[PDB]
Design an enzyme around this catalytic site. Structure first.
Site, PDB file in Angstrom:
ATOM      1  N   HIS A 130       0.904  -1.214   0.472  1.00  0.00           N
ATOM      2  CA  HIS A 130       0.233   0.400  -0.226  1.00  0.00           C
ATOM      3  C   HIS A 130       0.813   1.046  -0.047  1.00  0.00           C
ATOM      4  CE1 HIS A 130      -3.222  -2.480   0.491  1.00  0.00           C
ATOM      5  NE2 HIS A 130      -4.185  -2.116   1.358  1.00  0.00           N
TER       6      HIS A 130
HETATM    7  S1  FES Z   1       1.591  -1.310   3.404  1.00  0.00           S
HETATM    8 FE1  FES Z   1       0.199  -2.402   3.821  1.00  0.00          FE
HETATM    9  S2  FES Z   1       0.832  -4.005   4.904  1.00  0.00           S
HETATM   10 FE2  FES Z   1       2.791  -2.485   4.346  1.00  0.00          FE
END
Ligand code: FES
Ligand code: HEM
Ligand code: HEM
Ligand code: HEM
Ligand code: HEM
Ligand code: HEM
Ligand SMILES: CO/C=C(/C(=O)OC)c1ccccc1Oc1cc(Oc2ccccc2C#N)ncn1
Ligand SMILES: CO/C=C(/C(=O)OC)c1ccccc1Oc1cc(Oc2ccccc2C#N)ncn1
Lengths: 378, 241, 147, 75, 61, 52, 378, 75, 96
Positions: C112
């Site tokens: 993410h």
């Molecule tokens: S930013 Fe989603 S688990 Fe690493």
């Protein structure tokens, strides 16, 4: 005497499929109930022939699936039949639930509530089923979802490590997920039987939401032949996928073996979990994520208590009709966002659609029903 | 060649309804496995960690594990190297190939020693008697010196040379390593190397019997209480005039 | 009686003695030079071993106390300033980050988005706490067991 | 469960029916059919379409804005 | 002892199904401690010295 | 909702309150015993025997 | 109103377990019906926890079973619970059938005939279950029994090679036998439900074979508490085996991995197949073997048509009582012979017991019933 | 399925019963019990035992004859 | 797998014989090499996963069975990756 009535076994078949008083006016939207039963049977028959060749260990978990599609006589036909049947099952679950919501069928409290339990159980099955090929998406989907149970206060970490059989999605997790994937569809079928038991108590609802007692027709031959035609249409859609586009609804990463050290560029569900996957990433909190995620399905159990209209169906309800289609479009928005990365426009409109889903069910639709009553002086 | 003899019942300290294994005899028996059999007999299902808290301490079992060169997996370059053994390692197999046991013994295959007192009839009694009862062939029957003589062996011709003779290493305990004491200790160890749960099942088994002895009469009395309504019921038939 | 059988069936899911003994694994403290990362399987999820050089240690102790989400120093997060032992999974969902070629100190998550430094404290991205760190004890300077 | 004969009270209603062997299956399939589908599309396009057209705009804009966000004309 | 031990047990704890369940639950906790350990103690006597818990002091550090 | 608000219902609640309290005790001690919840069980005298 | 009666789900539970009119006088021999249900549930619960760790491939089929008993937390307890539960299931099936035969319970045509189907299905399950550990007895039992299907004229060889997935009991056979072993107990439970449906139609028979309508008692609490005590006795017998004698009813060859090139000295079933194994080796013909083997169980379906007595039960029938115990002793003779080699005294007395079994059911017991009628002037 | 009230016609039969709390569970457990079991053993030993005693003889002889068959005194 | 598809039975046997495939246990207890039969898999250049790293670049070349289904675009992508090999634009150093 007619043996259909007297004989203890045939008595049930007669009361369920033959002499059952059914409404004259039920839509093609009533077909999905039978289609779900076809899909549950189809999944049991394809699933078993896969289990005759599938290996439950991380070593040749991927290789056995390959062995099926490559070496096993028509094994490729059974494999894509099962994978697309699972999606077919999900298109049907959604039409069925939507029909229930639109037509006010939820007022059958027990029938509907058993259906909520039925939805969760088919979801739990498909989630566990996806891990079985032991592809990149199989493992990484599993790790990304199970790890949510860590966010539960106090109980948290202990639960995940109990479901895991260790400290990650490993050897043991693949094996137990197969066991649970084998048993669940039978427990589904038994609950689906109890589902129908509760339905026969009232009989079916209809597109008007007014009682059909004055115009009941026998299930045979009207709904026998209508369910045959409907099943022929479901086989068309299923066999269009299996025999022209077998890789369309699936993710390419599942075609490379699992690798716990290498995370894929995208981590996306099959279409049927995308709406709920979107809701999860939309809320930044860990626990708030899972609590909004459970509330994503568990909300259907509140829908009967949020019925406010003097009428059952949405047939004569234009305000509610617009707010219904808003829910379908909003879920299609959440579907789209689920299959997209977490960057700029998608974070905002993702959480915008997420707050709308809950506002539409909890506040918006119960208000429209009240206004619609006032407009009829009711 | 057809006729047979069955082992007698030796009074093992563990054979008896609530009798736990002699852990000191298991300990001694591991040593009897360590020098004697391990270079000819595989134990593919028992690891060094299995011994922990049973016959040896954590420190002791680590020290016994380090004594072998175990072939470890893929390195940074792409070749297989050798390292000192960890607790998680299995007991080392003398022959990596199944047919390598044939050419480097007699032609006959020495079977795996993990599960042997449960894989042959008579159990530990048989293995004890096969070791202990090694004797000279009777007249009319030529032995053929690729097959040694044993009465307890099903076909009377065994490819194993007797590895049980007075003193094949000593113990930390001041125990004389006589043929019988050497043979008993392996058999008391091979019991554990087939049934590790032994001690635990005898324990819960006592708890099972002590619970049932309390519960059986109690559920009986519950049933007898409810049924006393019918058991003491009296009938009278009173037809009209 | 019912407690015991229910517990025994419950326990048959929680451990597995052969998996529990692989909880502590051995790595070389001489194999890796300054800055570089190593790939080794500890507990299942990747173990990252980073060597902190002279042009990196002083940078971490300079960033202020009440800036991050949860108040945690860099001085108390390591037993010795020479070596930092890391766990290669995020506190959010659990993803393996692309090491060294990052922005705010070396690490960056491709799942993410999470910006981590030489110790692994969250600088940018929706993550609640800092990167995972295991227990520490020493007997020799060239070999350490992750207890 | 209820069966026929126990459902409800109905009075003074005559139903005239024909055998399926006396009548055609598709009476006026296109002549009566086509007008009917258009009629019930018209009856519902104002309730079904405006959420989907709204999604289409939120989809078309969102995809456009995603592409033109990473690129930059100055340094 | 003036009214029976059973009579005072019914009056105080067996009348209400609530306190009946509570007495079973509280009685299940206290029984488990007295039994598990009590049966383990009996298992000690029939296997005197044979067990690792008796040997322990032989291999110390 | 509004139908259950009256003098009888306040009486009916008061009548079932000791019972609903005692079922809570059954549930709690039941959960505590079944999980071996150490946090609560560290306080009770004879059950205390689990010296680390 | 009493919700036990009105509520659609609870209605069934009330009519089946609570308010069901049951005979006042039913023996401990009526307990096995409930005990079979306990055994089917016990097998599902132990079987599943084994399936969470069991591997379905010839490579580590044997190793996974080892992993369960050695490494898996209390895995040894579950494994012997399952293996002894299967035997427990068989002691119960036999008492139950015998009770049915003695007391004339077979006159319930459908109930009994569904029970014959139920016996075959539990047999088919256990046979396939035994192959799973992939021991010497697992493989050699499989090869020695499947190869019988070769003796069927014309269809023969094609059938065996279709069940085999090749030319012997191989990789594929182990895998499919697991699939079929997983599904069958659920299909059993569903048939067991239909079994009970047919039983409730007439209610239970009793030790006298005279109607109990004049003296019916409610199932609760009389047969509730009697079934609890009975289950406590079945757990005693099961836990005596699992916790003192776990290897007593099993064969030692199953503790060495499968070897298709090396046949064991003895090839013997677990006790529950020994009687039928004896009948098979007794007749020298290949096809006559299987045809006597199928007739060994399928005969129970003829028993109602061979009822000749004016009375239902054997309670007042001494001639039939002796010929009954002759059947039990004769089956115990066949049990003994099954576990013995095919040499001198055993071949003759083996086939002697075999011809007696069929003569006793087909000719001898139907004659005694006729004579007993003549003696009562009936 | 039949329920109570629909089973059968019964006339002029009085049943006297006692509460389980007024009566003992084991009235004369050994004093009445022991004579009873002996009585119903005696009533059935002539029907149950003679097939088993017959099996025992066919078992005892068969095992004996199996052992003494392979061995031979002359060549 | 190639039989009756792109080659005859005789052709596929001839292509199989062209490699030294490591066969299983012999009479003595060692592993020997024999000419390939039809039942043999396509020969793997690296027996170890990390042996691909040191004998190429450090990066791992992935398995070619399942590749037009394992990468987005399918065969179009693999064709374009091969066909569209070109020189780096300025500002970005390639590193050889
Ligand atoms: S930013 Fe989603 S688990 Fe690493
Ligand atoms: C440890 C002193 C030891 C034991 C104990 C032992 C037992 C044993 C058995 C029970 C078998 C055969 C299985 C059966 O009963 O049918 C057997 C097989 C062979 N053995 Fe052995 N074995 C012990 C150790 C040793 C040692 C040190 C050697 C080498 C000198 C050895 C040799 C073999 C061989 C060869 C066989 C196969 C021949 C055969 O019995 O068929 N054993 N062992
Ligand atoms: C396991 C998948 C399911 C199966 C097999 C199934 C089965 C069916 C069947 C056969 C019917 C009757 C025909 C019809 O009206 O469609 C029906 C109706 C119904 N089901 Fe389901 N269903 C399932 C999923 C659901 C779910 C998920 C819900 C609610 C969350 C639901 C609630 C209902 C309701 C309320 C009706 C009544 C509709 C009406 O007649 O008006 N069911 N179901
Ligand atoms: C509730 C009905 C079921 C659903 C929704 C379901 C869902 C799924 C899904 C989503 C997959 C992964 C698809 C893929 O990647 O190919 C899968 C695979 C699998 N399922 Fe099911 N399934 C069901 C019934 C069953 C049953 C009853 C069995 C056991 C008889 C079973 C055994 C398998 C096996 C072995 C696989 C792995 C092989 C493969 O991936 O093709 N399934 N299932
Ligand atoms: C899958 C194992 C089976 C289960 C779970 C089962 C279930 C039961 C149950 C619950 C009863 C009522 C209680 C009782 O009378 O014992 C019963 C009775 C009966 N069963 Fe079964 N049974 C099975 C096997 C069989 C078999 C193998 C047969 C015949 C070959 C049989 C034929 C009957 C008959 C005739 C009765 C009526 C007995 C009577 O009340 O007089 N059942 N069964
Ligand atoms: C009709 C009830 C069942 C019967 C009679 C039955 C019978 C058996 C038998 C005889 C064995 C071999 C015993 C041994 O050597 O240990 C076995 C093992 C096995 N069974 Fe079942 N079983 C039943 C239910 C099931 C179910 C429902 C499952 C799947 C959830 C299952 C999965 C297994 C597995 C995996 C094994 C192999 C592990 C082992 O041998 O311990 N069983 N069963
Ligand atoms: C093992 O991963 C299986 C997946 C799958 O079957 O997707 C259709 C999957 C693949 C990639 C990423 C995540 C995946 O799993 C899931 C699981 C999931 O579960 C739910 C579905 C509906 C509602 C709530 C939840 C939850 N929690 N919601 C979203 N994704
Ligand atoms: C795979 O072998 C499984 C066995 C088993 O489970 O025995 C209890 C078995 C083991 C050794 C030898 C044979 C075995 O299988 C069997 C199978 C068998 O099947 C039947 C049982 C009853 C009646 C008819 C048949 C048949 N055919 N009858 C006798 N032995």
């Amino acid at each position: 005497t007619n043996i259909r009535k007297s004989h203890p076994l045939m008595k049930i078949v007669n009361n369920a499929f033959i002499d059952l008083p059914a409404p004259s006016n039920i839509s093609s939207w009533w077909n999905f109930g039978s289609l779900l039963g076809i899909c549950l049977i189809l999944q049991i028959l394809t699933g078993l022939f896969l289990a005759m060749h599938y290996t439950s260990d991380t070593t040749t978990a991927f290789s056995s699936v390959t062995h099926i599609c490559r070496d096993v006589n028509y094994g490729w036909i059974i494999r894509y039949m099962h994978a697309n049947g699972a999606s077919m099952f999900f298109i049907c679950l959604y039409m069925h639930v939507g029909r229930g919501l639109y037509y006010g069928s939820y007022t059958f409290l027990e029938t509907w509530n058993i259906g909520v339990i039925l939805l969760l159980t088919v979801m739990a099955t498909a989630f566990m089923g996806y891990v079985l090929p032991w592809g990149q998406m199989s493992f990484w989907g599993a790790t990304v979802i199970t790890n949510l149970l860590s966010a539960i206060p106090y109980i948290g970490t202990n639960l995940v490590e109990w479901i895991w059989g260790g400290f990650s999605v490993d050897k043991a997790t693949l094996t137990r997920f197969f066991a649970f994937h084998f048993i669940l569809p039978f427990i589904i079928m038994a609950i689906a039987m109890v589902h129908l038991l509760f339905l026969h108590e009232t009989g079916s609802n209809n597109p008007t939401g007014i009682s059909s007692d004055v115009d009941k027709i026998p299930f045979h031959p009207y709904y026998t032949i209508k369910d045959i035609l409907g099943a022929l249409l479901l086989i068309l859609a299923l066999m269009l996928l299996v025999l022209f586009a077998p890789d369309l609804l699936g993710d390419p990463d599942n075609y490379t073996p699992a690798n716990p050290l290498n995370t894929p560029p995208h981590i996306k569900p099959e279409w049927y979990f995308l709406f709920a996957y979107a809701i999860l990433r939309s809320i930044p909190n860990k626990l708030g994520g899972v609590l909004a995620l459970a509330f994503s399905i568990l909300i259907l159990a509140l829908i009967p208590l949020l019925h406010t209209s003097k009428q059952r169906s949405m047939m004569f309800r234009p305000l509610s009709q617009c707010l219904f289609w808003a829910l379908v479009a909003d879920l299609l928005t959440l579907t789209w966002i689920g299959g997209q990365p977490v960057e700029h426009p998608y974070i905002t409109i993702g959480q915008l659609a997420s707050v709308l889903y809950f506002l539409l069910i909890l506040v918006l639709m119960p208000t429209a029903g009240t206004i619609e009553n006032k407009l009829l002086k009711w | 060649s057809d006729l047979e003899l069955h082992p007698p019942s030796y009074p093992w300290s563990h054979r008896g309804l609530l009798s736990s294994l002699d852990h000191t005899s298991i300990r001694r028996g591991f040593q009897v496995y360590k020098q004697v059999c391990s270079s000819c007999h595989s134990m593919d299902y028992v690891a060094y960690r299995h011994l922990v808290g049973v016959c040896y301490t954590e420190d002791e079992a680590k020290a016994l594990a380090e004594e072998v060169e175990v072939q470890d997996g893929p390195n940074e370059d792409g070749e297989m190297f050798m390292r000192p053994g960890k607790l998680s390692d299995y007991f080392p197999k003398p022959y990596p190939n199944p047919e390598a046991a044939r050419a480097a013994n007699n032609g006959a295959l020495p079977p795996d020693l993990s599960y042997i007192v449960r894989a042959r009839h008579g159990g530990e009694d048989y293995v004890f008697s096969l070791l202990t009862g090694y004797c000279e062939p009777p007249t009319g029957v030529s032995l053929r010196e690729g097959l040694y003589f044993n009465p307890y062996f099903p076909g009377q011709a065994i490819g194993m040379a007797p590895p049980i003779y007075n003193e094949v290493l000593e113990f930390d305990d001041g125990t004389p390593a006589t043929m019988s004491q050497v043979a008993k200790d392996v058999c008391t160890f091979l019991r554990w190397a087939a049934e590790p749960e032994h001690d635990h099942r005898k324990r819960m088994g006592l708890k099972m019997l002590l619970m049932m002895g309390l519960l059986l009469p109690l559920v009986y009395a519950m049933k007898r209480h409810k049924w006393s309504v019918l058991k003491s019921r009296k009938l009278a038939y009173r037809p009209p005039k | 009686a019912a407690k015991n059988v229910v517990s025994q069936f419950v326990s048959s899911m929680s451990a597995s003695a052969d998996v529990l003994a692989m909880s502590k694994i051995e790595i070389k403290l001489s194999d890796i030079p300054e800055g570089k990362n190593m790939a080794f399987k500890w507990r299942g999820k990747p173990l990252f071993v980073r060597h902190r050089t002279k042009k990196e240690i002083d940078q971490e102790a300079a960033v202020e106390v009440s800036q991050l989400r949860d108040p945690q120093h860099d001085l108390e997060r390591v037993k010795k300033p020479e070596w930092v032992i890391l766990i290669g999974v995020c506190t959010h969902l659990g993803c393996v980050p692309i090491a060294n070629a990052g922005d705010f100190g070396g690490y960056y998550c491709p799942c993410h988005g999470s910006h981590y430094d030489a110790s692994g404290r969250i600088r940018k991205g929706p993550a609640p706490l800092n990167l995972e760190v295991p227990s520490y004890e020493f007997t020799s300077d060239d070999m350490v067991i992750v207890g | 469960g209820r069966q026929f004969g126990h459902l409800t009270r109905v009075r003074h209603v005559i139903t005239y029916s024909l055998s399926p062997f006396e009548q055609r299956a598709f009476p006026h399939y296109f002549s009566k059919g086509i007008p009917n589908v258009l009629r019930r599309t018209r009856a519902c396009i104002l309730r079904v379409a405006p959420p989907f057209v709204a999604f289409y705009l939120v989809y078309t804009w969102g995809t456009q804005e995603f592409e033109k966000s990473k690129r930059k004309n100055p340094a | 002892v003036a009214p029976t031990l059973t009579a005072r047990l019914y009056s105080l704890l067996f009348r209400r199904t609530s306190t009946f369940a509570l007495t079973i639950v509280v009685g299940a906790l206290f029984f488990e401690r007295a039994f598990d350990q009590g049966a383990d103690a009996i298992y000690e006597h029939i296997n005197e010295g044979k067990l690792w818990k008796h040997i322990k002091h032989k291999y110390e550090n | 909702l509004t139908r259950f608000l009256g003098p009888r219902y306040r009486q009916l609640a008061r009548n079932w309150v000791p019972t609903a309290q005692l079922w809570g005790a059954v549930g709690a001690v039941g959960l505590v015993w079944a999980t071996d919840s150490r946090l609560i069980l560290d306080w009770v005298p004879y059950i205390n025997g689990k010296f680390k």
